[PDB]
Structures are given as C-alpha cells and as structure tokens.
Amino acid sequence: LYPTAQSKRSLWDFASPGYTFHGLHRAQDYRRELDTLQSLLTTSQSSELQAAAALLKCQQDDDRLLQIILNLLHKV
Amino acid sequence: NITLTKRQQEFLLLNGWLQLQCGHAERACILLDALLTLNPEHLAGRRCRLVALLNNNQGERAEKEAQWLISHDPLQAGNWLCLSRAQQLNGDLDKARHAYQHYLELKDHN
C-alpha cells in the first residue's frame, strides 16, 4: 500500500534516465537544443506537441530573466 | 511529419526527468507525451513518463503504460511497482497487491 524508502528508491532508479544528453559542452548544447526544439514544436498540429512547445518557450524566457538577475549579482 | 534527432530526444527526456525531480509531474508529463508521441518506443522515456503519470494521478493511463512496458520490457521489477501504484489509483487494490508481489519477487533478482 504505502510507499517505503525502498519503494521510492526503486521508483527513482526506475524513472531516472541516468547519463543522457551526450555532449561535450552542456551549456551551449542545451541552449541550442532548447531554442531549436521550441521553435520546431510550435509548427505541430498535435495538441500534445503544442503543449511541450509552450513549456519550452517558458523556460526560454525564464532563462532570459535569470540572465538579467545574474548580471545584477556580478556588480557587488 | 516531424522527426527528432538523438540529441533532441535526449533533451526532452532530460527535461521531463528534471521536471519530475522537481515535483512538477504535469510539466514532466507534457514533455514526455511529446517525446512519446514522436518516438513511441523510447523506453527510458516510457518509464519516466509512466512514473510522472503515477504522480500526476493518471492511473488508467499509468496502467496501460505499465502493462505496455511489462509486455515490452521484461523481468523488470519497476514495471510491477508502477502497475501496483496505477492499480491502487484506479481502486483495484487487489490488482495492486498482485502487482506489488510481482515487484517484490524481481527486486529479489539479487
């Protein structure tokens, strides 16, 4: 019935993809795939794809906002 | 007509997995549904989405996904834990006890 620390560890390990995104420069490669993928999925007519495209646009703009915050914490 | 590169499949997978770690199961499900709409055979994605559905309380979908994985990914204990949780979400408590007992037996693969 209820969960068990063993139950949730088996859940995590089950859901966890492990090492993924196989590349040499995680930061540039991430922003590049995010932008490419977000502009790619809007062109879908599928409701399921359209929702993903919207969420990606979101993190794309939350990253623009955090970039603004990060600049503010550089100067003192 | 849309096709995902390997890196792009990995990207969505990793975004779905990261949102699921944040406790954001709907966001996880949306990302993983898009992946599994275009690459239905992405097993890591099937698993991650299966657990995300179990946390966003989509028991009937979670069920169909768990039996799907059991029929396609075999001897895997986690499939049975997912079936148990999905079955308990659907109110079939006994179906969940049979599924949980199968889970215990293969966790016993040690």
Numbering used by the authors:
A (entry chain B): 47 to 122
B (entry chain A): 10 to 119
Text from the published report:
Several gram-negative bacteria employ type III secretion systems (T3SS) to inject effector proteins into eukaryotic host cells directly from the bacterial cytoplasm. The export gate SctV (YscV in Yersinia) binds substrate:chaperone complexes such as YscX:YscY, which are essential for formation of a functional T3SS. Here, we present structures of the YscX:YscY complex alone and bound to nonameric YscV. YscX binds its chaperone YscY at two distinct sites, resembling the heterotrimeric complex of the T3SS needle subunit with its chaperone and co-chaperone.
In addition to our structure of YscX50:YscY, we also crystallized a longer construct containing residues 32–122 of YscX (YscX32:YscY). Crystallization of this complex required the reductive methylation of primary amines. The resolution was considerably poorer, with the protein adopting a loose packing in space group I4122 with a solvent content of 64.3%. The overall fold is identical to that of the shorter construct and the structures align well with r.m.s.d. values of 2.033 Å between YscX32:YscY and chain A and B of YscX50:YscY or 1.388 Å with chain C and D of the latter. In general, the r.m.s.d. values were a bit higher for YscX (1.489 Å or 1.383 Å for chain B or chain D, respectively) than for YscY (1.233 Å or 1.078 Å) and the models differ the most in the position of the loop between helices α1 and α2 of YscX and in a slightly increased bending at the C-terminus of α3 in the model for YscX32:YscY. Even though this YscX construct is 18 residues longer than YscX50, only L47-P49 of these are resolved, suggesting that the N-terminus is largely disordered. Moreover, the C-terminus in this model is fully resolved and is helical albeit with high B-factors for the last residues. We found that the N-terminal 31 residues of YscX are prone to proteolysis, indicating that they may not exhibit a tertiary structure.
